[PDB]
């Protein structure tokens, strides 16, 4: 069981391949989403003086919203938005689209936690991708295994506090 797009789902996308007017993005869904130079520029595409499939190369991750599905079921992304767009530095972590909620916590509780304990900036993408951002390599590694562990956790009895102690003992040796 995996992720299925829904007009509104902000997602972390991986530019698979580039075309002429569009970029095809890996959305961690059965169907490949599309993002056009039209939507990206808020201006009709102009192959002559304009065109530059160098605004997004292959390998780029992009924070984008799903707006609808074209007459073939392919989801149509948009870069126009809050903080939507290409992602610079940081880490992208893939998780089971299923374990996404138990990483945010009741009222983003479980989430605020990690951001607070590791000081890392975190955005949990409803599609199973996560962008970790913080000024520290060792510190982020922790925050990764932090998400890694929560995901793999088969016995979730008391995990929030049980995880906070993990991070603490982690940074206690990582420095």
Instruction: Compute CA 152 distance to the chain's CA centroid, rounded to the nearest angstrom.
Output: 19
Report CA-CA distances (Å) from 14 to 29, 55, 114, 148: 11, 14, 25, 20
In angstroms, rounded to a whole number, what is the distance separating the alpha carbons of residues 151 and 155?
11
Spell out the residues 6+ positions from residue 66 whose beta carbon is closer than 8 angstroms to its own: 5, 6, 7, 8, 9, 10, 11, 27, 33, 75, 76, 77, 78
Position of tokens 């893939």?
Answer: 94
Overall resolution, Å: 3.2
Looking at the chain, which residues constitute the CATH 2.40.50.140 domain(s)?
1-89
Experimental method: X-ray
State the Rg of the chain over Cα.
18
| 119 backbone φψ class: left, alpha, beta (φ>0; ψ -120 to 50) | left
Contacts for 10 with CB less than 8 Å, ≥ 6 apart: 63, 64, 65, 66, 81, 84, 125, 126
DSSP-assigned beta bridge partners for residue 69:
75
- CATH 3.30.1370.10 segments of the chain: 90-175
Question: What are the CA-CA distances from residue 80 to residues 62, 77, 126, 129, 132 (Å)?
Answer: 12, 9, 18, 20, 22
Helix, strand or coil, per DSSP, at residue 21: coil
Q: Which CATH superfamily is domain 90-175 in?
A: K Homology domain, type 1 (3.30.1370.10)
What is the rounded distance in angstroms from the CA atom of residue 155 to the CA atom of residue 136?
A: 30
For the 1-89 domain, the top CATH level (class) is mainly beta
DSSP code for 32:
P
């Amino acid at each position: 069981e995996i992720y299925v797009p829904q007009a509104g789902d902000v997602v972390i996308g991986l530019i698979q391949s580039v075309g002429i007017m569009n970029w095809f993005v890996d959305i961690n869904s059965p169907y490949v989403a599309v993002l056009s130079v039209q939507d990206f520029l808020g201006r009709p595409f102009n192959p002559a003086v304009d065109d530059m499939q160098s605004l997004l190369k292959v390998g780029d991750y992009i924070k984008a919203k799903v707006v609808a599905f074209d007459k073939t079921r392919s989801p149509l992304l948009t870069v126009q938005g809050e903080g939507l767009g290409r992602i610079v530095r940081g880490k992208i972590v893939e998780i089971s689209p299923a374990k996404v909620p138990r990483v945010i916590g009741r009222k983003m509780s479980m989430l605020k936690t990690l951001e607070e304990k590791t000081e890392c900036k975190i955005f949990v993408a409803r599609n199973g991708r996560i962008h970790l951002e913080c000024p520290n390599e060792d510190l982020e590694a922790i925050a990764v295994m932090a998400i890694k562990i929560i995901d793999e956790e088969a016995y979730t009895s008391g995990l929030t506090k049980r995880i906070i102690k993990f991070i603490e003992e982690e940074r206690r040796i990582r420095e």
